[PDB]
UniProtKB/Swiss-Prot annotation, chains A, B:
One of its GO terms (molecular function) is pyridoxal phosphate binding. Homodimer. It comes from Saccharomyces cerevisiae (strain ATCC 204508 / S288c) (Baker's yeast). This is Glycogen phosphorylase. Phosphorylase is an important allosteric enzyme in carbohydrate metabolism. Enzymes from different sources differ in their regulatory mechanisms and in their natural substrates. However, all known phosphorylases share catalytic and structural properties. SUPFAM superfamilies: UDP-Glycosyltransferase/glycogen phosphorylase. Its EC number is 2.4.1.1. The keyword Disulfide bond does not apply. Disruption phenotype: Decreases cellular phosphatidylcholine levels. Growth on non-fermentable carbon sources is severely decreased (lactate or glycerol). Sensitive to sodium dodecyl sulfate, and sorbitol. Belongs to the glycogen phosphorylase family. CDD domains: GT35_Glycogen_Phosphorylase (cd04300). One of its GO terms (cellular component) is cytoplasm. The modification N6-(pyridoxal phosphate)lysine is found at residue 709. It is found in: Cytoplasm, Cytosol.
Length: 858, 858
């Protein structure tokens, strides 16, 4: 009884003898086996329809089929999830715990079908014989509302690669009920909605009602000097109940685990209250508890949200560390071996409280010496940093932090004290250094606790996400920490993406082409991306290029089908002429620095130029020869209160309404916006891409994984020389990317000249800003804040500066693609051929060998 | 696609031809079959552990096993739920819809094991081979928090019988999240707690996320004379989502359905609000919606609750009628045939709005003539009335009703108008009749709508729950209605209980005995309870009686085991001597008229008598000879604000603390209170019963089904000549029940004399009232209101009057049981032998033949 993920070997050798031989024989002659053949899947599927779902052939529809098929696949997974967890218990290897505030998991079923050792075609077969089109049942699955942007997607890809590599890793996070939110574009505006992804339960979790951790907030420390084992007599306690998500690996039978926490009240219902008619309060406790896992990134733009964000980050750090030390004590190993057995990765600053908490439990509960405990903490953590600009670094104010977490404030003051002593002993008399490098920021009037500095001081390794970013954190925001610790502590591991979701799941038709040309029927190239350089040989010969183009044309058709479906059966994109239609997409977070507005100003410019040309008596054959057939695809969500980002979404929608419906330019240009862009939409959108925009102001992006997703699928980049664009260029060659705009050196000066020595706007740009001051007749000055930020508030994101360069590169793109497609297709094949360094398997190799010092146990 | 419970035959003959023969062959070669053998169940079970629950042999504990096994059985059920629903669709028989505000379903697994055509033993076998004790896994199941008292349990039993009989019936109700509440006795007090029965989901439902009915509140009617099709432009809309619970029948493969509604907001999350930091309001709608199915019987003792109760009753009437007319229209039959096809039973007044609603939809939406519609309404409904005292008849105030339901007020005024005309034409010049029989009560200052009168006027049949009740409603509260309608309309169908839960589930050991003795290996007697009269032959012979008693002893052990478990391993009841311990239980709603206080006053009396006896130098052999070993088992819940009922629970607990721990009486008396008495507890508690108390003031109980449950299990009744006691007595014979106390004739006079001509309290009673004015040292006047109600406020429930009679009958009981158990055992065997009329199968036969005019379609 009692232990769900592994019996220590000894326990099993004792227990086994007290079980009567008949029980052991029966259990053994009826133990579940994994599917070995399609019939096996059919039998599980039909039994779940008839028994679980209490349904029959006559009313098992596609939602039923998905529920049943998911239940069958999870059954198979559980068998290997149990074996793997027992192997690690029996073999006690060093383990990796990956703490991330968001895991952008996407949809689980097809990924399980691909990472299945004995196949999508067998299951595909089996389902079709029972009456089901796999693709129709695949669509019934809601994307897990467990993450949001690239931070979470990086945690997701990693989790996959660790499982493929048999690395003993677990991810810990939160089980958000409602996602971050979900986007509807109502009347050209974004309206936020609850992302109801658990409405019909969730067939992939294991709810572990058995694992319930208590977590405490507020209270007081009573000793009756901080260094000593103190007692936190807290004021509120909530419960963390775990939910296990199994994680398959490609070709392994090693299934690793994601453990997410849901917050529950200590007292569900209060009958006293209800019976006295105080109904609202009888359920009050329940309400408070559930706030903590209700929504991702709760609005912290006011005290209550600042509090809830901290409250949530403590709850997950607390419960996860608890579960991480519980498992350790089954080893019965001495605390001094904890660093040799546990590696915890802080994916960004959000889990830094885990440092302060391990110190808190080792000193207050476990009674170690403050200094012996701190040595263990130090050797256990490592921090990945994703921030460029110092302003985005997380700080908490002392009043709030103290009130909510009294003992953890005490330990942060202690930690900082000894660190600042160590600094004083290394740089005698350097007064200002002590102020700058301190964890507590002495500010007016609220002192802050600088979390990123606490994370450097508590970790044995910090790393950036791309080489240039890494150089930059040693050179800029963490310079003093490099002086005191030495360059050694600051590493780089360039980000990457998983081949199985982003190439084999998202683009099967290309995955088959490669397995055909390179003659690799076992898809071994997904484990060894290095082999894709062989595609370079076949760059020179025609039938291959025809083949390569066809894949991309069929992929374009899928996207077109999606836009039609999403437009209630009406097509937006003109399907005839599609092979000569350049699909140009910019799908990412709507934010002024991502410069979606630069891209829109470029669209309006081209449109204005086309229209003017027609009216000056050119035939469309003449206009089309200069501005050929294009579809601009935009997708992404704005934060709920970012007014300017929400304006940019309305503006894209307005441009689309005038241009898409303007007969005169006869379908030479269309603008489309995809709502509630999530991973599944990105799996349809990315393999269809002819060109993808990666145009942020230079110097603003640290890495950038969707860039890599476009490259792995033969898409070309038009981008700024920033972020992941720089490393893409290194690997695939400068001659294959379309770079433009200013470089970072010139950014601070061009910014200065804008205010204290202004030049003027280019006529091109001035034509579009006057033309929107597009048309918007109902409110002919709605788009004014945007125009006036460029035209009157120093144009901080350099739209004016890059406008002409951007347009010049687009003239290039257009001629390349339409008029000399064999040159275009060579850029695409070579992209593929050299994308392999960005495989998240290589990121996990690097992390395992330099930071975690972890070996696979498979 | 789309229809979940049956394809009209035609639809299938058409569809079938379009399915390719290979799909049809595959589907057909992999269609789930029902378990035919234990291996079949093992395979489903292991697969659910490994796959659904992602677990393994090494960590599949009992919660896991239950979850898995439940899932396997539901799977089997679903196969026949689907067949049955399709048969009815194909055969279009008249259907019965049973509307009930509460369905006390209890725990579903074992019931399913028993009502399983090919067995608990096969499953049992199978589980044990895998490592599981059935009984350990059975306990993991929370009792469905879907009902509360007998009203709901009547609906539950019915549902079972209809299913066994192949009667085409569906039950409609609400899916309460939190039950009514759950009771913890903290410090001897009841503390209400949320009944968290859905904490780990619910493996028996089918969540039909597909069936979502809108329901509307407030608003206005706009015509721009009520008679006409009017438009209700309501002000709030909530959603009703169905959850299907399959309902097996014994030996049938006919599985019928319970459809429960959950209220959902029309808008789950409001991102606008959230983003503005108005977090609280962003989720506000959700909050309001969920109020409607959050809790059963919401506290209506203030406007807000009056409102919520009406709100809830409308929601369920509305959604259910909707679902009932929807299914009707698949028949494509004329509205004039609705009465020939739908029979809707109003289980009590709570669904009377269904009348007004069917009239509302037939007139406003379906556009029938007010008078033609009304004729259909009339012929469709029948009302079972469960109320004795007119005061408990539901009325709603016009302001509130009107405000919440404006159109339904209009129709109620109309309905009433014509009815009152009809009355005037039948009784010219009878002025006051018109006032009395009216549906709208002209009162100060708020006019009420008398729901029960509306229900009479809208039904074609009204029925009481027991013959005497029935006569009484014709004679009293509904007399004028009998004058005007004629006796014919007022029927009786005495209530009853299902044999399979209350005998075979709750008491297997007896069910085996009967199958052994009557040589009926097939348990056919559960279908034909009439055969149990054969047990009467075996009344006379010893081995049988030994056998009969053994059963009851083992059953008592079970209860004891329960109380121990519930007392943290500490036993309360002394296990040695158990066969001579009379288990005397009164498990029911704590209410002054149920007279638990009479029973407690009787316990304290006996204790005071015992103690006094000991102190007067009797040896316990002497005390024991007079007051033999008894365990009073109390169980039941008080309403949250019923101060006096809550006092009574403290008082029972106080008594138990003094008596149970009083060494002196050496275990001759124990008082035990079982907290949070639900059905499962009642399935352990009832077969263990030696005697059960049914002691309400005479004239206060309409029927009373636990009484029958006790009878079916050989328990004897001590009761008032009231309620179901009267019919129990008829059937099993007066000589087998212990009746006492005043008769109803005498109640009004005894009551009068209490105030305007008082006699004095019996000394017996005065001893106990002074003794509690038991001990309670901390607050030596806590129990005063109880004492002063009897002693100074006319003792309206006749405790004083019946005290002595009660004690006298107890003396009888005690002697019968301890000293002449063969006579006791004959009462028990004969009880059994003649309990058969109270089989809910016979209730359902009667209902089917007189009221519903329904035939089985099996
Ligand atoms: C790839 C991915 C991301 C990360 O992309 P960024 O370049 O970091 O914007 C975000 N969202 C989705 C849905 C993705 O698939
Ligand atoms: C039988 C039953 C009831 C109905 O009994 P009443 O005699 O009407 O009090 C109520 N609750 C439970 C748990 C039951 O099993």
């Amino acid at each position: 009884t009692r232990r769900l993920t592994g019996f220590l070997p000894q326990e099993i050798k004792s227990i086994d003898t007290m079980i009567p031989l008949l029980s052991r024989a029966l259990w053994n002659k009826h133990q579940v086996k994994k599917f070995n053949k399609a019939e096996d899947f059919q039998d599980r599927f039909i039994d779940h329809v008839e028994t679980t779902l209490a349904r029959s052939l006559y009313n098992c529809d596609d939602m039923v089929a998905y529920e049943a098929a998911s239940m069958s696949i999870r059954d198979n997974l559980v068998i290997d999830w149990n074996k793997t967890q027992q192997k690690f218990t029996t073999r006690d290897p060093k383990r990796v715990y990956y703490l991330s505030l968001e895991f952008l998991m996407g949809r689980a079923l097809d990924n399980a079908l691909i990472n299945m050792k004995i196949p999508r075609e067998m299951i595909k077969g089996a389902l079709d014989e029972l009456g089901f089109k796999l693709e129709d049942v695949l669509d019934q699955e809601p994307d897990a509302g467990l993450g949001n942007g690239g931070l979470g997607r990086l945690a997701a890809c990693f989790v996959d690669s660790m499982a493929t590599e048999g690395i003993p890793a677990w991810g810990y996070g939160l089980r958000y009920e409602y996602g971050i939110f979900a986007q509807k574009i109502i009347d050209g505006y974004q309206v936020e909605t609850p992302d109801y992804w658990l409405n019909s339960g969730n067939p992939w979790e294991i709810e572990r009602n058995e694992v319930q951790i208590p977590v405490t907030f507020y209270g007081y420390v009573d000793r009756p000097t901080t260094l000593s084992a103190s007692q936190w007599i807290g004021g509120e306690r909530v419960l963390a109940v775990a939910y296990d998500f199994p994680v398959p690996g490609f070709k392994t039978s090693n299934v690793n685990n994601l453990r997410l926490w849901q917050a529950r009240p200590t007292t569900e219902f209060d009958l006293n209250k209800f019976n006295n008619g105080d109904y609202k309060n009888s359920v009050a406790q329940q309400q408070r508890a559930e706030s903590i896992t209700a929504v991702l990134y709760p609005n912290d733009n006011f005290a209550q949200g600042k509090e809830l964000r901290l409250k949530q980050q403590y709850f997950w750090c607390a419960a996860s560390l608890h579960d991480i030390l519980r498992r350790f004590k089954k080893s019965k190993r001495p605390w001094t071996e904890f660093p040799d057995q546990v590696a915890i990765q802080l994916n960004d600053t959000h889990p830094t409280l885990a440092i302060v908490e391990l110190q808190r439990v080792l000193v207050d509960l476990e009674k170690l010496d403050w200094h012996e405990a701190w040595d263990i903490v130090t050797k256990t953590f490592a921090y990945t940093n994703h921030t460029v600009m110092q302003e985005a670094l997380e700080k908490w104010p002392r009043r709030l932090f103290g009130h909510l977490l009294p003992r953890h404030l005490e330990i942060i003051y202690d930690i900082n004290w000894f660190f600042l002593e160590d600094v004083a002993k290394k740089f005698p008399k350097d007064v200002d250094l002590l102020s700058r490098i301190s964890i507590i920021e002495e500010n007016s009037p609220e002192r802050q606790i600088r979390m990123a500095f606490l994370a450097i001081v508590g970790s044995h390794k910090v790393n950036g996400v791309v080489e240039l970013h890494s150089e930059l954190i040693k050179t800029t925001i963490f310079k003093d920490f490099i002086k005191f610790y030495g360059p050694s502590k600051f590493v780089n591991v360039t980000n990457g993406i998983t081949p199985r979701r982003w190439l084999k799941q998202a683009n099967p038709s290309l995955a088959k082409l490669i397995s055909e040309t390179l003659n690799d029927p076992t898809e071994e190239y997904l484990l060894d991306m290095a082999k894709l350089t062989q595609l370079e040989k076949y760059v020179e010969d025609k039938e291959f290029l025809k083949k390569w183009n066809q894949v991309k044309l069929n992929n374009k058709i899928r996207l077109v089908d999606l836009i039609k479906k999403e437009n209630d059966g009406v097509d937006i994109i003109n399907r005839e002429y599609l092979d000569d239609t350049l699909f140009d997409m910019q799908v990412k977070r709507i934010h002024e620095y991502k410069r979606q507005q630069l891209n829109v100003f470029g669209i309006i410019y081209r449109y204005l130029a086309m229209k003017n040309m027609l009216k000056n008596g050119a035939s469309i054959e003449e206009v089309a020869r200069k501005y050929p057939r294009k579809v601009s695809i935009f997708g992404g969500k704005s934060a709920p209160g970012y007014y300017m980002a929400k304006l940019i979404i309305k503006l894209i929608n307005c441009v689309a309404d005038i241009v898409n419906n303007d007969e005169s330019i006869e379908h030479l240009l269309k603008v489309v916006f995809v709502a509630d862009y999530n991973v599944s939409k990105a799996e349809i959108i990315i393999p269809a891409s002819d060109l993808s925009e990666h145009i942020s102001t230079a110097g603003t992006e640290a890495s950038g994984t969707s860039n890599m997703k476009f490259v792995m699928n033969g898409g070309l980049i038009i981008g700024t020389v920033d972020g992941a664009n720089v490393e893409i260029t290194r690997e695939i060659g400068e001659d294959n990317v379309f770079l433009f705009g200013n470089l970072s050196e010139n950014v601070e000066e061009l910014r200065y000249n804008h205010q204290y020595h202004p030049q003027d706007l280019p006529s091109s740009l001035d034509s579009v800003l006057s033309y929107i001051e597009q048309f918007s007749p109902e409110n002919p000055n709605e788009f004014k804040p945007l125009v006036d930020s460029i035209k009157y508030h120093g144009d901080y994101y350099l739209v004016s500066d890059d406008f002409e360069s951007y347009l010049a590169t687009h003239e290039l793109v257009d001629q390349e693609f339409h008029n000399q497609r064999s040159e275009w297709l060579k850029k695409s094949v070579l992209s593929l051929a050299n994308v392999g360094f960005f495989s998240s398997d290589r990121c996990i190799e690097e992390y395992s060998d330099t930071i975690w010092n972890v070996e696979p146990v498979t």
